[PDB]
Symmetry: D3
Subunit: 260 residues, 6 copies
C-alpha cells in the first residue's frame, strides 16, 4: 500500500534484498503506531515475496529510531496499557522467518534500540549510538531493552545503560557484541545489503531453519537447544537444497538452491 512513514525498496542482485527505510525524520523516526503498522505491513510483504531472501531495516543518517512515540504514550493509564494490550504489534518483526539485518546509523534509542536488537544481525554506522533512555522518562524498556540488551552486552553494561540512560558508541556496541560490524555512515546500508545478498543466495528454507535454531539459544537449556538443532539438522535432509549443496561440494561446483 502507499506509505506515510516508511520507504520500501527491493535491492541487491536479483532484487533479493528487501530494504525498509523508516522515513519520519521530523520525529527522528519515533515509532508511532502508524509507523509500526506500516513497518509490519512491509515486513509481511517482503516475507511473502519469493524473490526476497533477506530484509535490511534502516532509518536515516541521523537516527535509526529515537524510541517509541512519547507523545502517543503520554496520556495512557495503567488500565489502558493492560486492556489495550499496549505495544503488542511492536514485536511482529520477531515473527518473520527470513533474516532481517538492521543497518543502524545515528541514534537507536529506546524502542529504536529494541527494534534493532529484535533484528537478527546489527550493522552500525561509525556515528551510531545505542541507549535505553526510558528511565529518564520515568519508565523502563518495554520491548526487550532489559532482555536482549543484557543478553548481548552483559549485566554490568546493560544495568548501567538501563539505569542511567547513558548512550554507548558504535564501538562499545561492537566490542560488547550488540552489533557485529561497523561501517562508514555512507556505505553502511550498501554493506548491510551485501550481507543480506549472501544470505539470500542461500536456501530460504534452510536459512529459516538456521535462524530458528540460533534464536533457540535464548529459549532453552543448552541440552535442549542442541537437541532441537539436531532435529532441524535432520530436517534439512528432507529438502532438495541440502542434496544440492552437499553434492555441489563433493562435485566441486556451484550449488543452485531452489528454496525447496
Amino acid at each position: 500500500a502507499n506509505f506515510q512513514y516508511i520507504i520500501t525498496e527491493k535491492k541487491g542482485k536479483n532484487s533479493s534484498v528487501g530494504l525498509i527505510q523508516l522515513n519520519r525524520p521530523k520525529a527522528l523516526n519515533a515509532l508511532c503506531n502508524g509507523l509500526i503498522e506500516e513497518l509490519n505491513q512491509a515486513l509481511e510483504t517482503f516475507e511473502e515475496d519469493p524473490a526476497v531472501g533477506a530484509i535490511v531495516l534502516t532509518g536515516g543518517e541521523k537516527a535509526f529510531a529515537a524510541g517509541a512515540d512519547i507523545k502517543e504514550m503520554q496520556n495512557r493509564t495503567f488500565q489502558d496499557c493492560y486492556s489495550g494490550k499496549f505495544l503488542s504489534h511492536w514485536d511482529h518483526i520477531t515473527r518473520i522467518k527470513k533474516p532481517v539485518i538492521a543497518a543502524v546509523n545515528g541514534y537507536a534509542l529506546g524502542g529504536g534500540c529494541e527494534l534493532a536488537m529484535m533484528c537478527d544481525i546489527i550493522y552500525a554506522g561509525e556515528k551510531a549510538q545505542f541507549g535505553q533512555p526510558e528511565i529518564l522518562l520515568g519508565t523502563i524498556p518495554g520491548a526487550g531493552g532489559t532482555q536482549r540488551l543484557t543478553r548481548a552486552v552483559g549485566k554490568s553494561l546493560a544495568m548501567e545503560m538501563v539505569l542511567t540512560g547513558d548512550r554507548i558508541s558504535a564501538q562499545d556496541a561492537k566490542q560488547a557484541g550488540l552489533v557485529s560490524k561497523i561501517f562508514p555512515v555512507e556505505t553502511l546500508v550498501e554493506e548491510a545489503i551485501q550481507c543480506a545478498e549472501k544470505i539470500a543466495n542461500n536456501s530460504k528454507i534452510i536459512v529459516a531453519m538456521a535462524k530458528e535454531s540460533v534464536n533457540a539459544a535464548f529459549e532453552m537449556t543448552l541440552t535442549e537447544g542442541n537437541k532441537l538443532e539436531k532435529k532441524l539438522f535432520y530436517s534439512t535432509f528432507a529438502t532438495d537444497d541440502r542434496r544440492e549443496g552437499m553434492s555441489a561440494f563433493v562435485e566441486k561446483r556451484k550449488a543452485n538452491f531452489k528454496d525447496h
Copy 2:
C-alpha cells in the same frame, strides 16, 4: 559503629551511600563479621530515603581477596550443609536499590563474586579478577562459576575457575565482566557519579528496571520480555512516569518524586 567497614553518604544532596570494606591487613577477606556489617550497612542505605544508589568498594590494593580461609579451615561437609554456610553472603542480592562495585586491586574468590553480585562493576586500572578457590581444593561457592560464566563466556570462565588464574581490568572489561575502567585514584569518585545519575531518577522505576534486567538470567527470552512488559505497564501506575513523559512533551525538566 563498625569494625570492618566504613560507610559514608556521598554524591549530590548525599544521594549515594558509599560502603567501604576496611580490613586491609587481611586484604578485605570476607569474614563472617565483615559480612554481617556489610549487610547491616546495605540494609541501612536501603532504608534511607535520601539514598538512591550504593557504591561498594575496598582499598586501593584490594576490593576483597576472598572468603576468610582460616574461618573455613576446620569446617566439615555436615557443618557446611547444616550450618547453611555462606548463606548471608548473598544478602546484597536482595537490595532493590542499585549497587555499583568500584573494584580497585584484587577482587579474588569471594571478592570477585561479591563484585559480580553488584549490578554494575567499575574497575581501577590496576584491578585484577580471579577465582583461586581451585588452588585451595575447593570451588567458587557464591556464584563464581555462574555469574562469571554468564558475563565472560565458557572458555574464559573455565580457564579462570580451573586454573585459578587472574585477569586484568582490561580483560575484564573486554569480556563484559566490568563496564568501565578508571584510574585507581578517580575510580570511587567516578562510580559515585554513576550512582548519582541513578539516584536522580525515580527510585521506584529504577527498582523495576533493575529487577527487569536481573530477570534476563532467570527466564527464557519470551518470558523475560513478558515480565518486562508487565513492569513497563506498571510504570504507568506511577506519578513519575506521567511526569517523565509530559516533561519531554512539554520541553521541561522532569521532577521525579519516587512515586
Copy 3:
C-alpha cells in the same frame, strides 16, 4: 589403541596432560565416523588414566578440523538421519569429566568449530579461523554450532556467521569470547599443555566439580545454578584435598593434592 586418524601422546609434567591430535591432514582433519570413533576411544582412555588430569585436543597447523565429511552425509535422507541417530557419537566429548582444552591452529570450521566449542577452553593460534559454513552446503550446524556459538559470541555475530558461512579470525573469536587466549602458531599446543598441566596439578575431583558447575551456567536459571554450585561447594568439604588446600594456605606451604 592403534589409530588410523589420530595421534595420542601423554605430555606435560608427570605426563599429566593427554594430547590428542587429529591426523587426517589430506582431508584437513575433516571429521569422519572413523575419526570420531577413535577420538572418543582416546578420550575415554585419558579419562580412565589416573595420571591424566587434563586433555589437550588439537589438529594440524593448517587445520584443527575443517568440517564433517560431506561425502559421508551426501546420500542420507531425513528418515536415515532420524532413525540412524546421525551424528550421535559426535558430542561424546561432552561426557568427559576431566577438562579438555582445544588448541585451535588454522581452520576450525563446521563440525570442527563445534568440536572446539564442545571443549572447555579454547586457545587459538594467530592464524586460526572459526566458522560455520554449513549453510553453504544447504544444511545447518548439527552439533551445537547454532547453540554454543551464539552463547559465546552473541546473537548478531552468531546469526551472521551461521547465515552467511563467513569466517572470523582468532582475534575476532577472542574479542567475542569464543576463545580465551591467542598464541603463536608454533607455541600454541605447548601453551595449551601448560594450561592443562596447571589444571592437572589441582585435585581431579574438585576440578571435575568445578567444570560441572561452570557447565551448569548453560542449563539453569542463575538461581538454580547458584544453588547447585553451593551444593557442590559443600561437597568439596567431604574431600581430603579441600582440607589440604586450605591448611596449606594457612600453614603457608604448598598443597599436596591426592585427588581424594
Copy 4:
C-alpha cells in the same frame, strides 16, 4: 455471516460470548475455514466490552474430531514449513478474556488440543478425549504432546499419544484434564454459568490472573511467584482492587468497573 460456526451472546446481561462449532457433517473437523471464522469470533468477543468470558463448544456428538485430514493429505514437509502450516490454530491462546471449553462428545486430535488451549474444560457425561494422530502416521501438532502431558502425567499422555486410545470424561477429570463433568443436556448451560461468574469480576484483574496462571507452564516456580507478585502489586493500580477490598471491609457488595 458465518459458514462453520454459530456465535451467540449469553448469560446475565449477555456477558458471555458463546461460540459453537457448527460443521456436524464433518464432526467439526477443524478445517482452515472453520479456524478462520473461530478466530474472527474470538477476536470479536475479545473486543466486545459487554463480554467478559467466552464459552467454546461444538455439537452433542462432537466438540471437534480433529484437523481436516483431507486438507492435510497432499501437504509436503516443505509446504508445512514454508507455509507455516497450522499457525493460525493457536490464536485462541492470545485472547486475554477467559475461554471455557464445554466439551460434549468427541474432542479428538486437533479437537482435544483446541479444548486444552482453553483455560477451563467442562465435559459432558459422554465426552471422550484422545490424540489419534499416531493412527494417521503423524503426531499431535498443536500442543497434544505438551498440554496433555502437563495435565495428565507422562504415563497416560504417552499411552494416549502412542496408541491413539480415547479416555472418558471421568478419566479426563480424574486426571485433571477437565475440572467438571456435567450432563450432556446441561453442559453448555453450566459452562455459561461459570463464564458468567468470571464476567462479573473485574476484566482487568481477571486478565491478570489468567496471565499469571498460564505462567505456571513457562517459568520456574521462583520466577512464576515473582511475576505473580508483580501482577499482584499491579492490581493496586486499579480502581477495582480498591473497590473490592473496601467492599469487604465496609460489609457491602463490590461494584467493579473493569478499571
Copy 5:
C-alpha cells in the same frame, strides 16, 4: 516468645514434632503482619531446635487461615506495594530446611491456601475447603496461589478456582493432588503429627537433602533435576547416617540416626 497470634507446642515421640497453631479465630486466622512475624519466629525456632525434625502447622477447626488481612491491605497503593516490598516475609516458611506439614481444617482461602501450599505436605480435615477468592476482592493471589495451585491441580481447575473464587472440598483437593491425605476433623492434627513423627525418626540431614531435591522438581528441567538429585545422592555417602541406615538393612537391625 510472647505470642499474641499463635500457639507453639512440641509434640510426638521424644517431642520431635514442633506444632504451630495459628490462633486468631476472631479473624478466622487472617494473616496479619503480626501473625506472620510470629509464625516466622516460631518456624525459625523449631528450625534451630535439635530435637525437632519436622513441623506441623495448623489453625482452628473452622479455619486454617482465611487469607491475608484485607483490612491491612485496603489502604495500600501500588507505590506502597512496590517500595515497601509488600508480603516479603510471607514466604519465609519456604526457607525452612526441616519438613513442614500443614494440617488444614476448615477454610484455607487466599493467603491461607497459599500458606498451606508452601508447606511440603498437606493433610486435610474432612470439612476443609480450599480456594483463591482474591479475584472477588479485585486482586489476584500474591504468594503462589496462581503458581503452586496450578502445578498441583492442573490448569483447568486452577484457572477455574482463581478466576471465579470458588472453593473446592477436601476431596476435590485430594483427588487433584493438592493434599495427599484426608482425616476426620478431630484426629487430623494427631494424624499429621504421626506423619511428622516418622519423618523426624529419619536422619535430619538426609531428610533436608531429600526435601531440597523434591522442591527442585519445580525449578529445573528433568535433566537437571535428575543431575542435582544425583549429586545430593552422592552427598549422602559423605554422612554417617547413610552408613548407618545401609549397614542396618544388611545387618538386619534398626538404624540409629544421629543427624550427620
Copy 6:
C-alpha cells in the same frame, strides 16, 4: 547368556520385546550385573527391526525392590563422584522405542524409579510403589524425587520420599503415576497388548511422538509447542504419514513401513 533377566519376543508378529528381571532371591534388587544385562537387552530390542515396543516386568511379588544395598554399603563420597555411581542406570531413557512397565508387586526405591523411567506404567492390583531410600539414610538417586513429584504432585511426593511410605496401585493410578491397573495374572498380557498397539504404528512417527511427549518435562510450554510443531512438520517427510492419511481418506487400513 543372561544371569539376571529373561528376554522374550511376544505379541503379534513378535513385535513386542519382553524383558523380565529375574532375580527373585533379592526381589529383583538392581545390582550392577542386573543393570548391565537390562541395558544389553534394551539395546538389542532397540536394534531389532521387528520390535516396535518393549515391555519391562519383574515377578508377581516384585518388579524391583531397589538398588542393591550391599553393593552401595561401602561406597564413599569420593567413590560415588569419581566413579560416576549409578551412571548406567538411566540408559533406558536413551531407548527411542516406547517401553511399558508392567509393575506387579513391589516397585520400591530404584525399582520405582526404573518403572518411572519407562514411558507408560501398567500396575497389577497388588502393586506397591514407594521411595524407602530415606529409611536407609539416603535419598532417591535415579529420579525418584523428580519423576515422582512430576507425576504425583508435591504433597504426595514429599510424603513418600520423606516418610518412605508405600502407595497402592489405586493410589498410584488416581495420582497419575500409572495409567492402568490390571489383575496380577493378566497384567503382562495386557501390557503386551498395549505394546502391540504401539508396535502396529510407524516406528519413526512413534519415536517422534515419544520424544515430543518427553519434551514436556524439559522446556516451557511455548518451546515444547514449537518443538512439537517441528516434529509434526517432519512427519510430512515420511512415507508413513502419507499412508496414514490416505488410508483415512481412502477408507482403508493403513500399512505402515516405518519410514
